[PDB]
Each structure stands twice: as structure tokens, then as C-alpha cells.
Design a protein around this ligand. Structure first.
Ligand code: SF4
Ligand code: SF4
Ligand code: SF4
Ligand code: SF4
Ligand code: FCO
Ligand code: FCO
Ligand code: F3S
Ligand code: F3S
Ligand SMILES: [Mg+2]
Ligand SMILES: [Mg+2]
Ligand SMILES: [Mg+2]
Ligand SMILES: [Mg+2]
Ligand code: NI
Ligand code: NI
Lengths: 551, 268, 268, 551
């Protein structure tokens, strides 16, 4: 029996502390803590509703774009503005391409070194490694020659004595299970991923004006001026350039990222049977395509008690059932007001008093849906799509399963998706489906401009009296995001963000119920309490972002 | 062959400043960490966590005493004894001050560390301040922007390595190759400004011909930077004004995060 | 899926206009020829030669009559009954007129085909003239520059393919997205012009600060183009003035190849 | 006796006609004819000497840069200007990067389809094709998967019925000797080459301001403003960007282009025994590195009657022996004045009277060196380097020969280099040595700027009276280039360009001696006189450029 702390948790965005009680070699109880606060909700208060998005985008630069888009949607909700369809297409392209970058970086730069041992890679035979992937991937950069160059770079790094970010890593740990050859394959893919994520952000930059932190939005649409015949604006040459980067993403996603996901599951199959965070899941529909902020390409919904068969669909960002369920508590958080609050009536009054196991121990609030804890993010979004009978999602999941089957002789059932590896699989499925979103929305944009519609912006009016409430929903890389704006006498009188990492990472709630990160760790085997790799494996599967969770 | 060591500490950051490195092409992030420098501490990319990564930092500060470049992103919160940002149970201001004692050079990357930025705006809930304010006896090199073009940082580090000293700096300690001139004093839309050719609203006829964004709130007239020349992401033609949105002044203290998007600049 | 056919004829060309395609990225030349179009005749890349390539041309002119885009680079020399450019024993003007009869659209790529260019300058040794001059009955789309940015051409082709008609043109039949504005009316050095901040010689103090090049002979004030915005080679920041040399006016008849490099423009 | 005409010769620059007399299936006599003239020498006359380079660079856009550099060197010669060393480094990087692009495009886009059969590539086994390269190349993009993707692109093209550039090619010709697998390898490399040549031109563009047709030169140096601390000028960020592209070129050149050169020689060994064009060879030294227009990185010289042991070194661009020997005749060309002319006293008076076998038949002049015919270009440049004992060149040739020996069991001796394949090998060796030129000169620039030298330009004065003469030499991609300028009363009174393709392609001379293209074809076997692929093989080895040859 003993008490450990993991502080800082690395290979996440932001500042996270995890504490665990370990009994008889397994975690028996856990605490998640966000250790940095800025007060972004207070910073944006009393400003013009049109300004909010440029300020609150700075909640996070990893999930850049997301808070910007959620903020304009919130002001649009309050003001009753219908966004021009060309502005929906542009916003959708940006979100889809951003998310592609975000998920690739998570799987490789943030998560792979939980599962992959770089020292073991030095022992690999590059020819045997290449041979292992025959009939498993058609990727053009799995040759022995590619793998030998990568092995030599690792060799040179180790020989210099300056391991830097690779130093004091969990090399030779008993939970590291890959053969040398598979370790070398993963490091080669890690480096290749950096090129493909750059291509995704070239899409974002051409519409956003730069990334991180896009600058093309507005309450009322976008600032891109569509004119096929115009010099220095969004013309056909610029659109062709965008398309040239969209076309570069699919092969990496399908032939490297999707395959590696199945390979990791095949070598770590006990991770299909642990890391369950919740029994309830929530996602919002995303990528609207009509003239009235609807007709979403991806569905949403609510699953209760893991029952896909009886889920409740959500098809609108104005759904009163969704809106009315959401509250946050600060009983075990460092804020003053503790009872559950609907976010239009939310407060964020700091009340730091240090760490207590049974009192306050985090800057993250505790969100609930009609009083229940809920997991959000790619596992939620996948399970909802399967519940909706979405064929695209079923088919892509089956492709990952088939690779797993071929490697192990075993299959994967939906029950095994409620796990650390299931969560990773949801993220990979999302990434693959986003490539069809990109092709679909580029084609829609080209077709619509061809009909003679170049409209991008509806100038808002904001009444100087009255009190108006708006909420902007968005299915972000890490799950359902919502910004809640109250306008009074022309200015922002309340602003509250409820962010996907808030739902997952938040501490024990008003009824002392346990949220997803803390719940997922119960039962985790920990072979060496001084080097708790197994805990970090499960926490990474949620893709934590603490600037997002706390703001 | 040995690479120059770098220690990177995040304070009240959004991580945008690290994410800028993933867009860079000269060097790419992979060539940066394998060829150009030895990244001895960086919490976003480090294999090690918790006790092991704090071991790496202590080892590196001693091993490379007097030789490493210290980089900070985010503001430093001083309200209520530093508790608004706590790492391994201690205020980030203490981590930063200790690392600063043995630094060869110190860089504030982004507007937050350079002057307080968005985190210090409005009522300033956490008493956020700049890196130079935390380190009054040290020369801090300021690379502002939210975030800056990553090469504003990488070419500063390269000048230090190749030529043995910082690049030339202005009176706010910003490198002149990147921040030496107002955006409005090197903006391709100046001809339209000069002729009174102004967009009045996004999507209007002037906007759709690439006219000047002054009357939409462009802060170019009061913001130092290289956004119109170096621009962003190395694809050609990409910066906020070229895309159709005014400059917000994110580089510049008292402009970005203080003035409204559509509030007009003072023009000289 | 069949691809739209293109026939490319070189007259008094230097081949710079074809070479521009090897710098393109959207599409790359390999994607152009395998995915975007069917390049039915192009003498620089064709596997076939001699009687076999002339067969290919004749077969394509018949099979695709009324459907192909005809592209010409180089001027057409009329002096001495056409003998300054003979291909397969016949004057190039005859090859061009025969191909023009069946064309869906006709494009003069480069200053030489658009208005005579360098080959028609000075004394004009060969009586070189433009494509429009040899095809008086046809609307010739002109894409000037020496050579133009290849996307000025490629996005003109793509408008024809995707939307079934040419892009909008000015009164010289140049696409407005590329040639609709004077370089000086969208130049990032305009603020320096406005302040009287001028480089006097290459390497002087103002030149080394990126000041205006008007007093070095910049023809930006009298040249239509997109060189300051689209620029060249898709790496960012690359056009003659950004590199430190004045615009020579290569897009514009009576400017490029007529006026001296250091001769001043007329300012309007 | 049969008479054939090949008109147009394709896969060259410009307008070329080749005629051949054939006796019993063997070429007995040939005629080379440049069929287009512009009169660029006359266009540039009567202008300010400072303006010439912008005009005469338009002699050619394939060998862009080269006439620009030769013209400024000619004016600097006439005016006695010493070029700043930083301007030399910048000129050198541009020429070396440009030449890398040019040679890569020649070997693949221009020449490969003489030797490679695309229909035979469709029959290849991609796994066997990859296996053939094990232990022969370390290139990372030779996998079966890469090769299969390439094969499918060709399959799709053929299936469409729209072969385009590939239509009516020499597929199944008896002179096509490669097995299916090697045909497929070559097509894969043809495609890959297009990306590497683009990286070489990114170097050119960042210094030149664009390419084709650079815009950074001046009589007196360059227009690039060196200031490490300046916004909008040539600073350290811009220099770092240039270096990022220089670094991308070497692996392709060494592991693909150099290897394919050896492989083509291994399968076509009879092409080592034909296509000799001359017994005399000329090259000029190139890449000056001092403050006085000298200290060249590459050597030059003159070889007479193939005797490398007694060659004459040339170490200066002011060499009076070089200068005095160069003349041109128009006896068999369509100009009026026929006696050999030194270029400072040259005329170019058109006198077209139609084709005559024994009279005038070309717009190309006939150059001689002290009355002899001479071959220029990469064969000349390689042989001179070997005669000088340059170890770099010896070693690079030995690497090609080692690959060839591995495949055939045979070595190559110097006598076998006087051939079609020898000419191709010289070009590949040049391309490889140019990568070291780029590294050397980038490093020299960074170092010199570090010492405090930012100088780039010496403003000329041009006397308003008097007559004076200058000549600018340059070792271009296709051989020795010279521009000859006479200034009288401040303006150009004569301008003559003597271009490398002029040396090689020129017609019979004042003494009816036969120049290199025409001499190289004697003895060529022609299996099918309707489809003379063997003639085009030898002519393409010289890398013809007729805009250059004729101007
Ligand atoms: S300057 Fe901007 S991008 Fe950098 S840490 Fe501050 S908020 Fe994020
Ligand atoms: S106001 Fe803005 S858009 Fe207009 S010229 Fe100035 S910086 Fe450019
Ligand atoms: S316009 Fe210029 S680059 Fe094009 S063919 Fe004429 S001379 Fe060559
Ligand atoms: S004269 Fe030339 S450099 Fe100066 S502002 Fe006009 S176009 Fe730009
Ligand atoms: N994705 C993302 Fe960031 C988080 N959590 C937001 O919103
Ligand atoms: N290389 C080249 Fe062009 C030719 N011949 C020149 O000079
Ligand atoms: S908002 Fe920032 S990124 Fe540049 S264009 Fe203005 S300083
Ligand atoms: S010389 Fe030509 S390329 Fe553009 S900058 Fe001037 S029109
Ligand atoms: Mg309106
Ligand atoms: Mg909140
Ligand atoms: Mg001299
Ligand atoms: Mg000549
Ligand atoms: Ni985030
Ligand atoms: Ni040429």
C-alpha cells in the first residue's frame, strides 16, 4: 500500500497532476488536478460580443480554431443569425483539417512513447521489420532502407550522449511489449507523421490566415472575400492550392495511422479490458451544411448506461433537452460557489485553499448531464455514430478489426471498445472519416460558387437594451465543447466555457461521484510505483488539455 | 558532435508557441531536436514524466550551467504568492528564477511572456506579468506575437549558435529582422489606404477586390512586426490582412486584447 | 474518366513558359499531365518524334475537333514569308492557323505570344508579331510575363474546365485575377515611396533596409500583374522587388525590353 | 542509299531537324539543322551595357541563369570591374542549383524514354524490381509498394485510351533492351525526379527573385541586400531557408540518378562504342571564389587528339590563348559573311536561300578553336578534370564504374568514355560534384558575412567616348559559353554569343569539316528507318538546346 503523485504529467497540453493510491500492486483510488488557471471567462466579460472570439481562441493553441468557432456560434445563437452557407463550408474545412493535424500529433508525438521503446529499436533487423507489414499496409515508405536510415538517426542520438526529450524514458519496463522490429516501425512512423500533420495545417492556414490561431471568423460568417476573378482575394488559384494539400492527407491516415492503431491493439490486448471511464456518453452533431445552421454531416446523441440500442439522437444545436441538462459544480474545485450551476448563471470566483483529498484539489470544474457523470470525445463520438447506424463508421471500424483479426486470430466486440484502446480506436476512426468531410466540403464550396453565390458575411445588429442568451456547440477533437454568452445592454454580462477536457478531467462532483479520468484508473496494474507508466497510458488515451479544462 | 542545450518552461501558456514549431520548415521540428539543438526539457514532447522529468531538468541545469538557452512561454502569475500556476508542488516563478541563474541567454517567446498578453488583459485575474518583470537584472530577448512566426524564434537561436551573440535588438529587446518596422510601413495594401479605397464590411465590393482594411479596425498603423513580409506557414501569400481580416495588434502591448477588433487605430 | 485535351505549339520561344510548369505545385506538372488534362502534343516532353509526333498532332486535331485548348508560346515571325521558324518543312504560322480552326479556346502564354515580347524588340530582325495578330478572327486569351507565374495559366485552364468558360478578362484579354491591377497599386514598398524613402544604389543603407526601388528604375507604376501578391515559386516572399531588384516591366508592352533597367517609370 | 529526315526532334529545347543518309542499315552521313532564328545579338545592340543581361538571358529558358551571368561577366571584363566576393558566392549557388535541376530533367524527362519502354513496365513484378536494387542503392523510395502505385498510374493512363505525351512511343522497338522490372524502376524514378528538380529551383528562386529568368544580377555584382538584422532583405532567416533546400538534393542525386546511370550503361554496353563526336575537348574553369574574378573551384582546359596526358590547363577567364583561338564560320549556315570571324568582329547577317546538302542548311554557325572542331559540355568537362588529376572526379567516376562492374563483371576504361554513354556519365558526375559546390559556397557566404563583409555591388562607370572590348566565360550545363561585347561611345556596338550547343550542333565548317552531332552519327545502326530511335539516342546525349545554338 502507498500514495504516489505524477507531477507534471508530460505529453499533454498544459499543467496536470495525477495522484494515486496503490494497493496490492493495483490503483485503488485516483485524483486528477489542473494546477494552472488564467480566468479567461472574466477577461472576456464586459466586451462587445463581436470581440469575444479573438480573445477566447487563446484558451488553447493545441485545439486552436475550436474556441474561436464555438464563440462566434454562441454570439450567433444569442442574436438569431443564420450563417451563409459558404461560411459554413469554410468553417467546416478549417475544423476538419485542424482535427486531422491534432489527432495525428496525439497518436505519435504525444502517445506513442507510452507503448514504444526506442532502445529496443536499435536491436531490430530492418528487413524483418519491413517484411512484417507485407499484406498489412500499402504505404510507400515502409522499406528496409527507410527503416535503416531512421535506425541510424536513433543510433547517432544515443551515441552523442544527449538524449534530450528521449532521456530517462521507460526503456526496458515490463509493460513494454513490442518486438524490436515493431519499435523501429513506430519511430519511422513518428517522424513521417510530422510531415503529414504539416500538410493538414497548410489547409488551415490558407483559409484562416495563419495557424496557430486563425483570424478569418466573424460573428455573421467569415472574412474570406470569395471572388474567382479577383486579385489578392479567395480566387480559383487559391482554392486549387487548398485542394492540393487536402489531397495529400488520406494515404498517411489510411495506410500508416489506421494500421498502427490495429498493430498496437494486437500487441497490448489486455488494454481492451481496462480504462473504462463512464457508462454515459455525449456528442453533438457537427459540420452544418444548410442556410440555417443545421443539416450536419456527422450525427450526435446521448448514450445512458452503455445502451446503444436506446440512445437519444441530437440533430440540432438548439436542442432544449441538451441545453437544459448541463451544469457544473465546484464542491471539490478551487472556486467559491459550490452548488451545480447552469452555465448561463455560472460564476468563476477563485477560492484557492490548497490540496485536500476530501476537499478542493483542482482548478477544473465538475460537469454533469441531468446530474450524471459523462465521458466526451472520440470514444463518445464513435459509439454515438454506431448507435445511429452510420455505415461509414461501422465500415471503418471493421477495417481496423480485420487488421487486428489477421494479426491475432481474434476479433473485437463493441464491449471491448469501452476501454483505453477503444478510446484510441475512436480517435483513429474519426481521423479517417474527416478526410471524406474535407472532400465533400471542398466540392460543395466549388459547386456553390459556380451557381453565383459569393456571399460570406451577414453584418450583425446588437440591441442596446434587453438581455439575450446564446450557446455555441462544437464537436472538438477532444469532445463536445460549449460556450455560453449572456448579453445585457449591448455587452457581455456573463461568459462561461464548458470544455471537453472539463467533462473528462474534472474532480469529484457535488454528490462526490467520480468523473472519467479518476474512474478509468481504478484497477490499473502498476508494476513499479516509482515509474507508473501504466497510469500515464490510460490518462493519455483521453488526450488531456488543461488550458482547455481550466481556462 | 555535441548540440547546444535548450530548457523550455511553460507558465500561463496556451501552448500555441510550442505548436508554432510544428509549422516550421527551416528547421523543421524534427531537424531542430535531432540536429540543431539538444532539447533538454520540454514537457509537451518529453518521454519522461513526474519525478523522472524533474530529475532530467535538475541534471541539465547543473551539467550545462552557463551554456543553455532558457525559453519561457506564457505569463507569470504573482497574485496570492504564485499559486495560480504550480508545477511539482511549487510556483512556476520559482522554477523560472532557478533556471534563469545559469542561462547563457533568455527568450520570452510570445506576447504573454514578452509583455503579459491576453492572460494579463482586462481585470488581470491572476496578477500575470512578463518574464522581464520576474527577472529584473537579466536581459530578456522578447519575441512577441500570439503566436509569432516560429522562424522569428528559430533564426534568433540560430544567430546565437552560429555567430556567438544575439541578433540586433530594438529598445523593447525585440530582434530588428522581425520587429523593426510597423506593419503599415510595409503593407501591400498601402496604395488603397492612400487613395481612400477602403473595405466597409466583409463581403462588400471593396473587400472583394483586396482594398485596405483600416476602416474595419486594422491595427497595422500601430503594430511592429513582419506579418506582411515573412507572413506565415511558408506557402506564400498567407497573413491575416491577405486573407481579408484586419490586424488586431496581437504583437503589441496596449493594442491586441485591449482594443476592439473594429476600433480604429491612431494613425500618425 | 476522359481528360480535356490540350495542344501546345512552340513558335519563337525560349522554352521558359514550359519550364514555368516544372515549378508549379497546384497542380504539379506530373498531376497536370496524368490527372488534369490530356497533353496531346508537346514537343519538349513527347516520347514520339519526327513523323510519329506529327501523326499524333493530326490524329488529335481530328479526334478532338471543337474541344481542345490550343496554347502557343513564342512570337510568330512574318518577315520573308515565314522562314524564320520552320517545323517539318513548313512555316510555324501555317501550323498555328491550322490548329486554331478546331480549337475550343486559344491561349497566348508569355509576353512573346501575347504582344511580341523580347523577340519583337529593337529593330525586330524577323518581323515577329503576336498570336492575336496572326488570328484576327479569334479571341486570344493573353497571359503575359517572361515567363508568367505558371498558375496564371493553370487557373485559367481550370476555370475553362470546371465552369465551362474563360475567366473574366480585361480590355487586353488578360485574366483579371492575375493582371487586373498595377503592381505599384498593391506593392508592400508603397509606404517607403510615400515617405521619400528610396534606395539610390544596390548595397546602400536604404536598399539594405528594404526601401522603395523607384529611383533604381522600378516599372511597378506602369506594369499590370500579380507579382507582389501571388509572387513566384510558392515558398513565400519571392519576387524581384522583394529580392532587391526593380520590376523591369516584363509583363507590359512598351515597358519590358524597351525601357532601360535604370530608366524611371512615368508615375500616374 | 536511303535518305531520312527527323523533324521535329522532340525531347530537346527548341527547333531541330536531323537528316541522315543510310547505307545497308548504317548511317553513312548526317546533317544537323537549327530551323528557328530570332536575332538576339542584333536586338541587344545599341543599348546601355548595363541592360544587356536582362535581354540576352531570354536566349534560353531551359538554361536560364546562364546567359544572364555570361553577359554581366562580359561587361565587367570590358569595364575592368572586380566583383565582390559575396556576389560571387551568390552567383555560384544560383549556377550550381540551376545546373542540378537542368541535368536531372535531362536524364529523366528528356532522355529516359529513349531507353525505357513503358508498355514493358506493365508486365513487371514490383517485388522482383525492388529486390534487384538490394545492395545497389540505399534510396528510401524503391519499395514494391511504391513501384505498384507507379505501375497502377501507368495502367490507368493506358486504359483511358489517352496516352498524350506517351502516345506512339517506341514501345517494343528492337533496340529497347531493359527487362520489365528495370523499365518500372525507371518510371518510378522519372516521377520522383520531378520533386527533386523542384527543390533545386527553390534554391535558385530564393536568391534570384524567381525562376525561370532570375532578376538579382547587375554589372558590378548582385542586387541582393545582405543584412542579417534587416526586415525584408537577405537576413539569417532567408539564408536558413535556402540551406533547407540545398540539403534536400544529395540523396536523390547519389542514390537514384547516379545509380540509374550505371544501370543504363550495364544494359546498353554497345553504346560505349559509338557516338564519338570529336577528338578535341574544351571547358572553362568555373565558380570563382576570390576578390578578383578568379580562384575557381572547378578547373578548365583544352584536350587535343584525346590525349589527356598532354592537355593544356586554363585557370583564368582572361586567358589570351583561349580568347585568340575562338572563331565562327557561316559557310554552310544561312548568313552572308562566310570566312571565320573572331567574335569581337563578328557579324550575323541573315541570308536564307533554302536547304542545300552541299551549301547552306542551318541557322547555327560553325565554331572552331585554332581551326579545329571541338566538343564541349559534360564529357569535355569530365575529361579535363580527369586530365588535371582532380581526385573528386576520379572518385565519383569510380563509384559509377563499381556499380556497373557489380552488374556486368566488367570495368570501364577511359577510351570507352568517348561515346554516347560516356557523355551521359560526364553529366551525372557533374551533378554529383555540384552538391559539394553548393555546401562549400553556402558555408563561405555565412562565414564571410560573419566577418563583417556585407558588400554586394560596385557601381560601374562607362566612358562616353572610346571603344573597348570584353568577354564573359561560363561553364554552363551543356559546356563552355562565351558572350563578347564591344562598347563604343557608351553603348553596345557589337554583341556576339558563342554558345555550347553552337559548338556541338553547328554545320560543316569553312573547310567542310564535320562537327560533333554530325560526326557522332556516322556508323549508327538503324533497325527501322521509319523509326530511327538509335539516331535520337546519340543526339539526346549532347542535351541539345536550339534557342541557345542559334539565338
Ligand atoms: S502568446 Fe498567445 S499563442 Fe503564445 S502562449 Fe500567449 S496566448 Fe498562447
Ligand atoms: S491600415 Fe492595415 S491593411 Fe491598410 S495599409 Fe495599413 S496595415 Fe495595410
Ligand atoms: S515570354 Fe519570355 S520566358 Fe516565355 S517564351 Fe518569350 S522569352 Fe521565353
Ligand atoms: S516604385 Fe516599385 S518598389 Fe516602389 S512602391 Fe512602386 S512598385 Fe513598389
Ligand atoms: N479539443 C479540444 Fe480543447 C479540449 N478539451 C477544446 O475545446
Ligand atoms: N547550358 C546551356 Fe544553353 C546551351 N547550349 C547555354 O549557354
Ligand atoms: S494580429 Fe498578430 S499575427 Fe500579425 S497581422 Fe496583426 S500582429
Ligand atoms: S519584371 Fe516581370 S516578373 Fe513581375 S516584377 Fe516586373 S512584371
Ligand atoms: Mg448585409
Ligand atoms: Mg468554464
Ligand atoms: Mg577583368
Ligand atoms: Mg552567335
Ligand atoms: Ni486544448
Ligand atoms: Ni538553352
Amino acid at each position: 500500500s502507498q500514495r504516489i503523485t505524477i507531477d507534471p504529467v508530460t505529453r499533454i497540453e498544459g499543467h496536470l497532476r495525477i495522484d494515486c493510491e496503490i494497493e496490492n500492486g493495483v490503483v485503488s483510488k485516483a485524483w486528477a488536478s489542473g494546477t494552472m488557471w488564467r480566468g479567461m471567462e472574466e477577461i472576456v466579460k464586459n466586451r462587445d460580443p463581436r470581440d469575444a472570439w479573438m480573445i477566447v481562441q487563446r484558451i488553447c493553441g493545441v485545439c486552436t480554431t475550436t474556441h474561436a468557432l464555438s464563440s462566434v456560434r454562441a454570439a450567433e445563437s444569442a442574436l438569431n443569425i443564420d450563417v451563409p452557407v459558404n461560411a459554413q463550408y469554410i468553417r467546416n474545412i478549417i475544423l476538419a483539417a485542424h482535427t486531422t493535424h491534432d489527432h495525428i500529433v496525439h497518436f505519435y508525438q504525444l502517445s506513442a512513447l507510452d507503448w514504444v521503446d526506442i532502445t529496443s529499436a536499435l536491436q531490430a533487423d530492418p528487413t524483418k521489420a519491413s517484411e512484417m507489414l507485407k499484406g498489412v499496409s500499402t504505404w510507400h515508405l515502409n522499406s528496409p532502407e527507410e527503416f535503416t536510415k531512421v535506425q541510424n538517426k536513433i543510433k547517432d542520438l544515443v551515441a552523442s550522449g544527449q538524449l534530450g526529450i528521449f532521456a530517462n524514458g521507460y526503456w526496458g519496463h515490463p509493460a513494454m511489449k513490442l518486438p524490436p522490429e515493431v519499435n523501429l516501425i513506430a519511430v519511422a512512423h513518428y517522424l513521417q507523421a510530422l510531415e503529414s500533420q504539416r500538410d493538414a495545417n497548410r489547409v488551415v492556414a490558407l483559409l484562416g490566415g495563419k495557424t496557430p490561431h486563425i483570424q478569418n471568423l466573424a460573428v455573421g460568417g467569415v472574412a474570406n472575400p470569395i471572388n474567382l476573378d479577383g486579385l489578392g482575394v479567395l480566387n480559383l488559384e487559391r482554392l486549387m492550392y487548398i485542394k492540393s494539400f487536402i489531397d495529400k492527407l488520406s494515404d498517411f491516415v489510411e495506410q500508416v495511422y489506421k494500421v498502427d492503431t490495429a498493430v498496437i491493439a494486437a500487441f497490448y490486448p489486455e488494454w481492451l479490458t481496462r480504462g473504462k471511464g463512464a457508462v454515459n456518453y455525449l456528442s453533438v452533431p457537427e459540420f452544418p451544411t444548410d442556410s440555417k445552421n443545421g443539416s450536419f454531416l456527422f450525427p450526435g446523441g446521448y448514450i445512458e448506461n452503455a445502451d446503444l440500442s436506446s440512445y437519444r439522437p441530437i440533430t440540432s444545436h438548439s436542442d432544449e433537452y441538451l441545453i437544459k441538462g448541463i451544469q457544473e459544480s465546484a464542491k471539490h474545485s478551487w472556486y467559491k460557489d459550490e452548488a451545480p450551476q447552469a452555465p448561463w448563471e455560472g460564476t468563476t470566483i477563485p477560492a484557492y485553499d490548497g490540496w485536500s483529498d476530501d476537499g478542493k484539489y483542482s482548478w477544473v470544474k465538475s460537469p454533469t448531464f441531468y446530474g450524471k457523470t459523462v465521458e466526451v470525445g472520440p470514444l463518445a463520438n464513435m459509439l454515438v455514430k454506431l448507435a445511429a447506424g452510420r455505415e461509414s463508421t461501422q465500415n471503418k471500424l471493421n477495417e481496423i478489426v480485420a487488421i487486428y483479426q489477421k494479426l491475432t486470430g481474434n476479433t473485437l466486440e463493441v464491449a471491448q471498445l469501452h476501454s483505453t484502446l477503444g478510446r484510441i480506436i475512436g480517435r483513429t476512426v474519426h481521423s479517417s472519416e474527416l478526410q471524406d468531410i474535407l472532400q465533400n466540403q471542398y466540392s460543395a464550396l466549388i459547386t456553390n460558387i459556380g451557381k453565383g453565390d459569393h456571399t460570406t458575411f451577414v453584418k450583425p445588429n446588437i440591441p442596446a437594451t434587453g438581455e439575450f442568451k446564446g450557446v455555441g456547440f462544437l464537436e472538438a477533437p477532444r469532445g463536445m465543447l460549449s460556450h455560453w454568452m449572456v448579453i445585457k445592454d449591448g455587452i457581455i454580462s456573463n461568459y462561461q466555457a464548458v470544455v471537453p477536457s472539463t467533462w473528462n478531467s474534472g474532480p469529484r462532483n457535488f454528490n462526490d461521484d467520480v468523473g472519467p479520468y479518476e474512474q478509468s484508473l481504478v484497477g490499473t496494474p502498476v508494476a513499479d510505483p516509482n515509474k507508473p507508466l501504466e497510469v500515464v497510458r490510460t490518462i493519455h488515451s483521453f488526450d488531456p488539455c488543461m488550458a482547455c479544462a481550466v481556462h | 558532435p555535441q548540440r547546444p542545450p535548450v530548457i523550455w518552461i511553460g507558465a500561463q501558456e496556451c501552448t500555441g508557441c510550442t505548436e508554432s514549431l510544428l509549422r516550421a520548415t527551416h528547421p523543421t521540428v524534427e531537424n531542430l531536436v535531432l540536429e540543431t539543438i539538444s532539447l533538454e526539457y520540454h514537457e509537451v514532447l518529453s518521454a519522461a514524466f513526474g519525478h523522472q522529468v524533474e530529475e532530467n531538468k535538475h541534471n541539465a541545469l547543473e551539467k550545462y550551467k552557463g551554456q543553455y538557452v532558457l525559453v519561457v512561454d506564457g505569463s507569470i502569475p504573482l497574485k496570492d504568492n504564485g499559486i495560480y500556476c504550480m508545477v511539482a508542488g511549487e510556483p512556476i516563478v520559482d522554477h523560472i528564477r532557478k533556471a534563469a541563474e545559469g542561462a547563457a541567454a533568455i527568450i520570452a517567446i510570445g506576447s504573454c511572456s514578452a509583455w503579459g498578453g491576453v492572460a494579463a488583459a482586462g481585470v488581470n485575474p491572476t496578477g500575470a506579468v512578463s518574464l522581464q518583470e520576474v527577472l529584473p537584472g537579466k536581459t530578456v530577448i522578447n519575441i512577441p506575437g500570439c503566436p509569432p512566426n516560429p522562424h522569428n524564434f528559430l533564426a534568433t537561436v540560430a544567430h546565437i549558435i552560429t555567430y556567438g551573440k544575439p541578433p540586433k535588438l530594438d529598445d523593447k529587446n525585440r530582434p530588428t529582422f522581425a520587429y523593426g518596422r510597423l506593419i503599415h510601413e510595409h503593407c501591400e495594401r498601402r496604395p488603397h489606404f492612400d487613395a481612400g479605397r477602403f473595405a466597409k464590411e466583409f463581403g462588400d465590393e471593396g473587400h472583394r477586390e483586396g482594398w485596405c482594411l483600416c476602416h474595419l479596425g486594422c491595427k497595422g498603423p500601430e503594430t511592429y512586426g513582419n506579418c506582411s513580409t515573412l507572413q506565415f506557414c511558408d506557402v506564400g501569400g498567407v497573413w491575416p490582412v491577405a486573407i481579408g481580416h484586419p490586424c488586431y495588434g496581437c504583437n503589441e502591448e496596449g493594442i491586441g486584447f485591449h482594443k476592439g477588433i473594429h476600433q480604429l487605430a491612431n494613425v500618425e
